Structure 1
């Protein structure tokens, strides 16, 4: 508690309703404070939270939505 505070930007392949799936999965993750679609193409998700493990999050995304990659973490 509260755990490490991070802002994480993920690129996800979500062209398909696919955006809605990505956003829901990320929003459902423990420690999440905010989730936002960003970039001109709305092809990225910015997540702010406390004690989020980006490793698990990324793996859950690749398993359930599509290819996903960490672009920023701070």
Structure 2
């Protein structure tokens, strides 16, 4: 099937309320299939989906959370 991609973004989201806003944003992005929080500090979003533009995703997060940094983009090997 179609190429899927894993994207890991560091996001400024110090508490649960801020995490929920970031997760809701990410979940609404066209081609996102899943969103999970990862990291020791719970400040990474792990997103998996189809045809997502990672830079646009980061732009949208940055203008909602105040800081967002792309850490990893990896096609899903399948």
TM score, norm. by length of structure 2: 0.86
CA RMSD, 1 decimal: 1.4
2-side partners of 1:14 and 1:66: how far apart? 9
1:27 is paired with a residue whose SS is helix
Aligned to 1:12: 11
Matches within 5 A, 1:49-64: 49-64=49-64
2-side partners of 1:23 and 1:66: how far apart? 14
1:41 is paired with a residue whose SS is coil
2-side partners of 1:20 and 1:33: how far apart? 16
Listed one character per residue, the Cα deviations across residues 39-72 of structure 1 (whole Å, up to 9, x for unaligned) are 1211100000001011111101111122000100
* Stretches of structure 1 lacking an aligned partner (at least 5 in a row): none
* Stretches of structure 2 lacking an aligned partner (at least 5 in a row): none
TM score, norm. by length of structure 1: 0.90
> How many residue pairs get matched?
73
